């Protein structure tokens, strides 16, 4: 018909992109980082344990002050802990017990939840009365919500299982922009440090970078074999690490449209559940399904330490804004903080 | 540190109050059974209780049945959430499209071998049983056509027939049950079990069957905790 060409021409565009992409690759970080000494042995110990949840904990996030963090479990409770004192501050009940994502506003005034109910709930913590109450209930998606992130106290970027991410305005309560283009479910999304662009992984072995200001798609990085479970930008904002269900994490640099390193080991056989860089970006923590999360080296690709402690698969992995501590949550209803 | 003593102490009253509420509602959380209800499609899953919740109660026991009819077809991602559910209710329509039975069998196998829905039992409802009581008598889509092994199948000796039911029907329905039992017993059965049933025209019996199977699952889990079976 009149579309066969589309393929022929689209496939030759892809071939040209790969060919031009190949000409850029002439070296790898493995040789460049040989001169720099390896990180060495890292012995992280659980400083705190937060045993307050009933069911498995499936999401978590850190506050901008790196002191109190919210966690979501499928028991229908959203708990705002206090890492320093391990004292709960707010135990918000939820309507839908099947929560899959959570977020804490940068200003610390609002919290975000969402899950299989295809609805993103936004709760206000600084209410005049003094009790946490529902503030907004965004509902414009068809599939489930996998991850939501606050840009400010007015707009929020939410991924969905319908293969479309959305930019919602809390003040109005409707989608401002829709970042369509993905084929499979969108599992995780990360915002850039400057809150101008963000990346999102999907269940088609593809990570797409968008621009909230413009609302279009600018790059598409491929190279994983299966669906991507989590991603996050490098602290500098010019690179991001994505872990897949192939027990492999990869680092991509947006400026060169390509992958830079792969952290794969023979012993590890299960997919990655979460990934997060350190404050300086040297380390790359990544949760696994082996009930333990490894501490990879961003330039050596060698396990510089393994953080076990959990007896079930780890679902959330966060690093404080100042990098002092690291929080890990698992399907065992426990949060461990590793300083 | 004068203000520290009278501020941090006030920060423990809130913690104690939250602990009290969590302890209070843990009871209600642990005593209510949760049940996922999924089906291939056009099976009539609304006939059990009668888009996301259906709370019911039998013999002073609460059941929360969670439907998932407002999602898309790719269950390989959002199905991992229902791993702690007590039992996954799977309603298969025994009735274009294709060998809907083959698709149901494939979905059941995938659920049985998911590596996450491993400790979760599966109640199975072969719905539209009476619906195929006429197809076999006609032969529009006779089972042997879509299942060569059916042409040599023998009805089980212990298979209780429905009073006044064409053997052919009884035979086809027991053959399907088998396809499912073989699929379920091919893998390890030491951590979860499959409970097959035939849906009837009355809903007062389906709820009782679900309650009985949930009690059986709880008892088996308790026995396994003590290493008795």
């Amino acid at each position, epitope marked *: 018909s009149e579309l066969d060409q589309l393929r022929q021409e689209a496939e030759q565009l892809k071939n040209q992109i790969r060919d031009a992409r190949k000409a850029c690759a002439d070296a790898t970080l493995s040789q460049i980082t040989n001169n720099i000494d390896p990180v060495g042995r890292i012995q992280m110990r659980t400083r705190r344990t937060l045993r307050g949840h009933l069911a498995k904990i499936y999401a978590m996030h850190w506050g901008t002050d790196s002191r109190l963090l919210v966690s979501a479990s499928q028991d229908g409770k959203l708990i705002i802990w206090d890492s320093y004192t391990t004292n709960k501050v707010h135990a918000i009940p939820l309507r839908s017990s099947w929560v899959m994502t959570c977020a804490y506003a940068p200003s610390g005034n609002y919290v975000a939840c969402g899950g299989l109910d295809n609805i993103c709930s936004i709760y206000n913590l600084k209410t005049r009365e003094g009790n946490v109450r529902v503030s907004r209930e965004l509902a414009g998606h068809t599939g489930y919500l996998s991850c939501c992130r606050f840009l400010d106290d007015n707009q929020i970027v939410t991924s969905s299982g319908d293969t479309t991410c959305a930019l919602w305005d809390i003040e109005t309560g409707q989608q401002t922009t829709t970042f369509t283009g993905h084929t499979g479910d969108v599992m995780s999304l990360s915002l850039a440090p400057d809150t101008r662009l963000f990346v999102s992984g999907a269940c088609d072995a593809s990570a797409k970078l968008w621009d909230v200001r413009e609302g279009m798609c600018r790059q598409t990085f491929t190279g994983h*074999e299966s669906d991507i479970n989590a991603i996050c930008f490098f602290p500098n904002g010019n690179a991001f690490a994505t872990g897949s*269900d192939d027990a492999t994490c990869r680092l991509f640099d947006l400026r060169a449209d390509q992958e830079l390193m792969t952290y794969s080991h023979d012993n590890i056989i299960c997919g990655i559940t979460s990934v997060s860089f350190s404050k300086s970006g040297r380390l790359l923590l990544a949760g696994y399904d082996d009930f333990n999360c490894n501490v990879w080296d961003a330039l050596k690709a060698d396990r510089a330490g393994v953080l076990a402690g959990h007896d079930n698969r780890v679902s959330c992995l966060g690093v404080t804004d100042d990098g002092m501590a690291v929080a890990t949550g698992s399907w065992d209803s426990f949060l461990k903080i590793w300083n | 540190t004068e203000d520290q003593r009278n501020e941090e102490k006030a920060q423990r009253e809130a913690n104690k109050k939250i602990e009290k509420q969590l302890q209070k509602d843990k009871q209600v959380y642990r005593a209510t059974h949760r049940l996922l209800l999924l089906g291939a499609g056009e099976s009539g899953k609304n006939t059990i209780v009668k888009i996301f919740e259906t709370k019911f109660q039998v013999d002073k026991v609460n059941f929360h049945m969670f439907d998932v009819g407002a999602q898309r*077809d790719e269950r*390989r991602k959002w199905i991992q959430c229902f791993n702690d559910v007590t039992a996954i209710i799977f309603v298969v329509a025994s009735s274009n*499209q*294709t060998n809907r039975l083959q*698709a149901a069998l494939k979905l059941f196998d*995938s659920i049985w071998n998911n590596k996450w829905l491993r400790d979760t039992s599966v109640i199975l409802f072969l719905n539209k049983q009476d619906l195929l009581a006429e197809k076999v008598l006609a032969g529009k889509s006779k089972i042997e056509d879509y299942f060569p092994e059916f042409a040599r199948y023998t009805t089980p000796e212990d298979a209780t027939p429905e009073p006044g039911e064409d053997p052919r029907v009884t035979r086809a329905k027991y053959f399907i049950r088998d396809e499912f039992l073989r699929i379920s017993t091919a893998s390890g059965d030491g951590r979860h079990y499959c409970y097959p049933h035939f849906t009837c025209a009355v809903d007062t019996e389906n709820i009782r069957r679900v309650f009985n199977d949930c009690r059986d699952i709880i008892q088996r889990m308790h026995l396994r905790q003590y290493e008795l079976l």
Partner: nanobody, 128 residues
């Protein structure tokens, strides 16, 4: 980039034989269980066959049981389906699918158009 191409197939008469090939480039072929489904004109996707990573565990749909053979060549990273004794109701598009997760004994691939890890497919028909 996961890429699943299909070679072979096309048109035939009642009872012919074609060796359809599925070539994979972008994943470790040996670590994935690979299925192969068919979609008739006017109907949805129906699973038609599968094969394990090693090639031992083989499953067949009842409709074409005993008329089709399926195998995998890990060394050549290919999946070979020998189709025989064709039948009039075998006219459809055959899609080579790959199970989504490595080292898994179950997968969910007969979904709608929305399935990234499936080949573009080929339309093969059989008539007079």
């Amino acid at each position: 980039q996961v890429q699943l191409q299909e070679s072979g197939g096309g048109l035939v008469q009642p009872g012919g034989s074609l060796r359809l090939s599925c070539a994979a480039s972008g994943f470790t072929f040996s670590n994935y269980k690979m299925n192969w489904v068919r979609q008739a004109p006017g109907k949805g996707l129906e699973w038609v066959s599968d094969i394990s990573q090693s090639g031992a565990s083989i499953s067949y749909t009842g409709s074409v049981k005993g008329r089709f053979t399926i195998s995998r060549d890990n060394a050549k990273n290919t999946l070979y389906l020998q189709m025989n004794s064709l039948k009039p109701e075998d006219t459809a598009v055959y899609y080579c699918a790959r199970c989504p997760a490595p080292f898994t004994r179950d997968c969910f691939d007969v979904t709608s158009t929305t399935y990234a890890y499936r080949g573009q497919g080929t339309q093969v028909t059989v008539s007079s």
